[PDB]
Amino acid sequence: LLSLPLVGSLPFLPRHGHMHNNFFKLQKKYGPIYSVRMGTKTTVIVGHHQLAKEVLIKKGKDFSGRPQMATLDIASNNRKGIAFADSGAHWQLHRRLAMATFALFKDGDQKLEKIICQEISTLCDMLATHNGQSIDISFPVFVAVTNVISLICFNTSYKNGDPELNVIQNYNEGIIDNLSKDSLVDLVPWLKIFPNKTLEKLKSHVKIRNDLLNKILENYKEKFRSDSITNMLDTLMQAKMNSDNGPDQDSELLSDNHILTTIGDIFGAGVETTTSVVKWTLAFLLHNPQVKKKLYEEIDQNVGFSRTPTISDRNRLLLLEATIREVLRLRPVAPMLIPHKANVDSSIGEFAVDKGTEVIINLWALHHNEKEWHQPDQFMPERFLNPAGTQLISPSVSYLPFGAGPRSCIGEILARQELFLIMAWLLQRFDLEVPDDGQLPSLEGIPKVVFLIDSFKVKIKVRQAWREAQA
Ligand code: HEM
């Protein structure tokens, strides 16, 4: 009695549980490196820190391209910008200029810390008007970190109640929704098998996004002074200037669509991800009041109420720095990075990997590795401190929240500051507690282009100690 023909097989149900954890459950059967084939496209999944560091660092440039996706093609205006562009001059140029702009914000009145502490102060007043109420702090934080990103790109910020802030939130919410139904890792190309409006809806929100950035770029051309370089849009237009003296090879790379999409990748990435981490950290502090207490005690002991937090306070506020590290471990912004692609025939762990092969780092597996992490499913900021509690450690090498190699986060500095500063300023001012209905946020989360958390509310009272310190 024979056996049936078999035209296809998959090791686990599609659209059942989260992708990254399904790949990770799978290492028990098939190991830390294994592949899957859809027609002609082939995808490798890496889930051990050593092989991941080979893809990202040692052979970093070999695996530094990005794969063509129909949904990502739109959000990037056909693979322009940075995050979703293939390895090339465009990507190399724009990524370089983008980083050069962050250099401008080391010193002065445009000192990055000053810009942040500024928009954080407005945030804290805004939140104090809700003393005694339970609220969803998504939008107030969204506006804070939009203004920072907007000051670095434009030297502009949105005044309060501006209706554009609600427009931006809308198309951001729309891009996130149609860009993926899970992480950017669909085994099955569902949107080509069945008819659907997914791409049509996406174009709408990107169209709004693109038209809006376009207005801003036209208005700025009058205002541009070659002698005044203080934001990203300057760095980009200066580049276009120095190229067209006829034009250089760099000229075709700095058209207004290439400049537009670059800003849109800075904005799109920076804002929604920084906001998500803030929501994720409060989520964890509401589940772990014991950690919350030691964080209040630490910040009262080392900063007080005579002044506001400063980057300088990073050296004394250690448990806070560890808590941010432990949230980015348990809940990586990008539990599977962005897909890398093999630019050239190569090898991972001495296995052959053909040109054009989608390679995926399963960061979720690196951060939950039983052997590399003690009690990996637990929230223990202690694990990033010596047993004393007096300086920070790197307890494991299987920890790359911002990735590594040629394709790592370019806004790592900015995020590490914002996340520290925001969280300091709030813990100083505010008591943060479970609302009166008694509901706690769900830490399960929601994988999209960003690893998001279900919306949740928090009761917020100004702190006893902070009041009495005003006389
Ligand atoms: C806690 C905050 C953040 C985390 C954990 C994070 C993490 C990451 C990761 C894992 C990648 C991809 C790594 C890879 O594909 O190899 C990435 C890419 C990127 N991030 Fe972030 N990121 C954060 C915040 C930001 C911020 C605030 C910005 C603001 C500009 C930003 C801009 C970018 C860009 C432009 C890329 C694409 C780089 C490229 O493809 O060359 N990120 N980030």
Ligand SMILES: CC(C)[C@](O)(c1ccc2cc(OC(F)F)c(OC(F)F)cc2c1)c1c[nH]nn1
């Ligand atoms: C891990 C990575 C996928 C990402 O989450 C990321 C990167 C670029 C994004 C660009 C967006 O704008 C437009 F191009 F689609 C975007 O749209 C929406 F959020 F508004 C979301 C984006 C998310 C990220 C974030 N930080 N570092 N990497």
